[PDB]
């Protein structure tokens, strides 16, 4: 009953969420910089959907980070390539900051 490792599946979804968020953030910036086009409703909607993504991404990263601890506590069971694992770790860490950097330029 061997199972397929879904880590890389969720990883791709997080990246996809990070890409959408980035597009939303650049939009937010362009709105908040020029209140010529920047109507309140559109600003509210953009800030809201940017949060909708930052939300999914943070839960996602929590879970992903935990699976790392699970593999490290039970390595024999999972049989993961060590370079691959280090990449998993670097993905979690770098995505954390990428998102963190968006949140900083927002909440201030």
């Amino acid at each position: 009953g061997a199972m397929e490792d879904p880590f890389f599946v969720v990883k791709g979804e997080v990246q996809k969420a990070v890409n959408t968020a980035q597009g939303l953030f650049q939009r937010w910036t362009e709105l908040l910089q020029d209140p010529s086009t920047a109507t309140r409703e559109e600003i509210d909607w953009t800030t809201n959907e940017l949060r909708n993504n930052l939300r999914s991404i943070e839960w996602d990263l929590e879970d992903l980070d935990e699976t790392i601890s699970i593999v490290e506590a039970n390595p024999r069971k999972f049989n993961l390539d060590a370079t691959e694992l280090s990449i998993r770790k670097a993905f979690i860490t770098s995505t954390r900051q990428v998102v963190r950097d968006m949140k900083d330029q927002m909440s201030t």
């Binding site: 199972m3 490792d5 879904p6 979804e13 879970d63 992903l64 935990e66 699970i70």
Partner: peptide, 12 residues
């Protein structure tokens, strides 16, 4: 995502 990870990793 949670359910996929839970199924394979046994999230607590």
């Amino acid at each position: 995502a949670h359910g996929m990870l839970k199924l394979y990793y046994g999230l607590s």
